[PDB]
Amino acid sequence: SKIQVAHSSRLANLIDYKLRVLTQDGRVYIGQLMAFDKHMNLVLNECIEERVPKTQLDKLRPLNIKVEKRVLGLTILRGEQILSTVVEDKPLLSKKERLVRDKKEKKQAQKQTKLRKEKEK
Amino acid sequence: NNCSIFVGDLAPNVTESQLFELFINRYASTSHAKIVHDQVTGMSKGYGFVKFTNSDEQQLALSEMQGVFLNGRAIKVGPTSGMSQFIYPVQQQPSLNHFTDPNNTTVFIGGLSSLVTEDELRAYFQPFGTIVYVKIPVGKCCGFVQYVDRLSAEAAIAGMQGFPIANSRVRLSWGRSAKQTALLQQAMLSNSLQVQQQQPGLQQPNYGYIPSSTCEANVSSTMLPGCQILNYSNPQQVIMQGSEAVVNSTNAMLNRLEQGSNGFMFA
Amino acid sequence: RGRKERENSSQNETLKVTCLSNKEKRHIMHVKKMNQKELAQTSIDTLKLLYDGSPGYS
Amino acid sequence: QSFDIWKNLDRIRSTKKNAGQFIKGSLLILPMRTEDKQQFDECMDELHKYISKDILRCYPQKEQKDEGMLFYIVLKDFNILDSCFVLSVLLAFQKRLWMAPSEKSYFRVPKNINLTGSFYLPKNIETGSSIVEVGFNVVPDFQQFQVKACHVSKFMNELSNFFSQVEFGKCEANVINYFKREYNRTYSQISLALYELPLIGDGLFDIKSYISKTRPIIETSKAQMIKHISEMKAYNEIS
RNA sequence: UUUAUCAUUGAACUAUAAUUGUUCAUUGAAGUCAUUGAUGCAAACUCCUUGGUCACACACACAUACGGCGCGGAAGGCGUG
């Protein structure tokens, strides 16, 4: 889908990407990751869960496929019953804009620590 | 105006008489005063309302009682009443004529041919509801039909409109009684005020009466809601509604047909 | 934009822009914010006080 | 036109623009009542000789009243002509017993009779005059339809114009027994309500507490009425 | 296009079943709503979020197939300090 996912990136670098994560059933969840852990428990913002019916599976066996989509919103999915994750869609704001946003967050956090040091005195 | 002031944080030994003595008769005239006590304990919660007629006297009392010694504590007599989108609607009054009175149940009939009698005009307006008098002015080709119910007057106007009595079309409207018409004629000859008076109510609620119900005629009544309990008599007093009412009405209408076939009554 | 759109739009009319001072727009937006929050917090409570004497009110 | 059923059947077969196709998922229920059974049986045997068993079915009652029987006539997967024929025959027969006891013809409709009847249809209808719908029907599931005061040809034309516009579909399988149970339940309720008619006074209203509950209240209301009459007399007095 | 509960008995009954099948009912345990339901097929209309809605010109190039020799932005590969 001409996204060109990064060639040397991991889960700390794939954050806030619109993932298309596959499970053991095939119940594909599409949404933005915002956190993970050692067991790969993924929170998913604006997530949608898509499946294929049993009648559509005969047409899928060797065209249009009518998938069943349900809307989950902000969910938190476990890492046991998942199989694979890919990157489907890029986020809204770019890498330089995320860098400027992270510098603003660091400056705001340093200002908050200076405010806590001023309130402690 | 009825300005309200809310006294708060009062002592326990302060009844409504002490609050009425401290509120009224001190450069003002408090119309009402009530201390909000407990629902089941009887003790006062320390709050009370005082409603006066004038707003200036209540404002002066709230300005003078702000911090006064009330049974060992403060009075706190600041006002309770007087940027949201929702406000209650307010209206003026139609100055109380005989059209805009909802209790006005007497119908002015006109356009008569000066030929119908009083018993016949009673017979025109009898099944619409109970009635009190059917007297008409002489030489004025008009009359007055006063019911007890207002829905009976609505049914009478909605049915009897456009009905020609003795080859003469009728004119139905509202109007006052004879004494109120005499008062309006006495006040209009000098043209000083010409003010009218509202017709008195029914002192509602009234569980027993059923509107638009007529009865012409011991009584062991069960007072059940599906039937009728009480009714106004036909001239007048209050009668208990018996079970043998449709039988007496049927005998009365058969007697009326027998006496109207011959000519003993025209109504 | 297109040429004929410019000859059509610049000849029809010129509208008037309304604008207010700083304290006026501040007071109006504060009244609109309190109206939005009082509409977000309110709810119709007519059925509770309209069936108050009903036999299954308790 | 004429007063014969078969001539109007030929006319409604002719000029209704290929009306031979029936309606997919079509159902009609006509509950009727007869005084006697023996006169009904010959007409129903002639109807079953004319109309097949798969299209039309009949359902008797349980004989609870023993005087007024109730018979269901269920037309299932019917065409537009057989519906008009069955409704014309039944609407003639359930009124010929009161109007013409000496005519003695189960398929000849006289001129003095007007066809007026009531038939149920399922709720899943789509219409997108003499036959009207009803408001405030008594059946939870079905819709009652009324025809009133028509001749034979007007009945044929109005029933054909009604079934040419309505669209049926997807009826429930044993909905007939559901309608039987609901109809029997509703009319057993109104029969019990008529059974409650002598039991008004002193029977089941707890009169012993109801007298004492309303004994001061009617007295105060009567005092208010006497005060109203006295205040009205003071209001109408000139003096 | 496809489904919308079983069992005992009564009046007939096809019948290897816990009378299965047909018409009517008493009773017994839970008893998805949905039949305008569910699946498949297919077209049209409308509305939402995104962009460089950019700088010059409305132009005759190419077998080594296309002068990728403008200012940038978004994603990525390779190389150097």
Swiss-Prot record, chain A:
One of its GO terms (cellular component) is cytoplasm. Residues 6-91 form the Sm domain. Residues 98-108 have a biased composition (Basic and acidic residues). It is found in: Nucleus; Cytoplasm. GO terms for molecular function: RNA binding; snRNP binding. Signal peptide: none annotated. Plays a role in pre-mRNA splicing as a core component of the spliceosomal U1, U2, U4 and U5 small nuclear ribonucleoproteins (snRNPs), the building blocks of the spliceosome. Component of the Sm core complex, present in spliceosomal snRNP U1, U2, U4/U6 and U5. The core complex contains SMB1, SMD1, SMD2, SMD3, SME1, SMX3 and SMX2 (Sm proteins B, D1, D2, D3, E, F and G, respectively), and is probably a heptameric ring structure. SMB1 specifically interacts with SMD3. Belongs to the snRNP SmB/SmN family. This is Small nuclear ribonucleoprotein-associated protein B. It comes from Saccharomyces cerevisiae (strain ATCC 204508 / S288c) (Baker's yeast). The gene is SMB1. The chain holds residues 2 to 131 of 196 of the full protein.
Curated annotation (Swiss-Prot), chain B:
Component of the U1 small nuclear ribonucleoprotein complex (U1 snRNP) involved in the initiation of meiotic recombination. Involved in the formation of DSBs at recombination hot-spots through meiosis-specific splicing of REC107 pre-mRNA. Collaborates with MER1 to promote splicing of essential meiotic mRNAs REC10, AMA1, MER3, HFM1, SPO22 and PCH2. NAM8 interacts with the pre-mRNA downstream of the 5' splice site, in a region of non-conserved sequence and is required for efficient splicing of uncapped RNA precursor. The RNA binding domains RRM2 and RRM3 are required for NAM8 meiotic function. Within the U1 snRNP complex, the RRM2 domain of NAM8 is positioned to bind to the intronic region immediately down-stream of nucleotide +13. GO terms for molecular function: mRNA binding. Signal peptide: none annotated. Transmembrane segments: none annotated. Disruption phenotype: Affects the meiotic recombination and the formation of viable spores. This is Protein NAM8. GO terms for biological process: mRNA 5'-splice site recognition; mRNA splice site recognition; mRNA splicing, via spliceosome; positive regulation of mRNA splicing, via spliceosome. Residues 3-82, 105-177 form the RRM domain. Keywords: mRNA processing, mRNA splicing, Repeat, RNA-binding, Spliceosome. GO terms for cellular component: commitment complex; cytoplasm; cytosol; nucleus; spliceosomal complex; U1 snRNP; U2-type prespliceosome. Component of the U1 small nuclear ribonucleoprotein complex (U1 snRNP). It comes from the Eukaryota.
Curated annotation (Swiss-Prot), chain C:
It is found in: Nucleus. Belongs to the U1 small nuclear ribonucleoprotein C family. The lineage of its organism: Eukaryota, Fungi, Dikarya, Ascomycota, Saccharomycotina. Component of the spliceosomal U1 snRNP, which is essential for recognition of the pre-mRNA 5' splice-site and the subsequent assembly of the spliceosome. YHC1/U1-C is directly involved in initial 5' splice-site recognition for both constitutive and regulated alternative splicing. The interaction with the 5' splice-site seems to precede base-pairing between the pre-mRNA and the U1 snRNA. Stimulates commitment or early (E) complex formation by stabilizing the base pairing of the 5' end of the U1 snRNA and the 5' splice-site region. It comes from the Eukaryota. U1 snRNP is composed of the 7 core Sm proteins SMB1, SMD1, SMD2, SMD3, SME1, SMX3 and SMX2 (Sm proteins B, D1, D2, D3, E, F and G, respectively) that assemble in a heptameric protein ring on the Sm site of the small nuclear RNA to form the core snRNP, and at least 10 U1 snRNP-specific proteins SNP1/U1-70K, MUD1/U1-A, YHC1/U1-C, LUC7, NAM8, PRP39, PRP40, PRP42, SNU56 and SNU71. YHC1/U1-C interacts with U1 snRNA and the 5' splice-site region of the pre-mRNA. This is U1 small nuclear ribonucleoprotein C. Present with 2140 molecules/cell in log phase SD medium. Disulfide bonds: none annotated. The chain holds residues 59 to 116 of 231 of the full protein.
Curated annotation (Swiss-Prot), chain D:
It comes from the Eukaryota. It is found in: Nucleus. Component of the 18S U1 snRNP particle, a subcomplex of the spliceosome. Interacts with the nuclear cap-binding complex CBC1-CBC2 (yCBC). Directly contacts intronic sequences of substrate pre-RNA. Component of the U1 snRNP particle, which recognizes and binds the 5'-splice site of pre-mRNA. Together with other non-snRNP factors, U1 snRNP forms the spliceosomal commitment complex, that targets pre-mRNA to the splicing pathway. Present with 361 molecules/cell in log phase SD medium. This is 56 kDa U1 small nuclear ribonucleoprotein component. It comes from Saccharomyces cerevisiae (strain ATCC 204508 / S288c). The gene is SNU56. The chain holds residues 43 to 295 of 492 of the full protein.
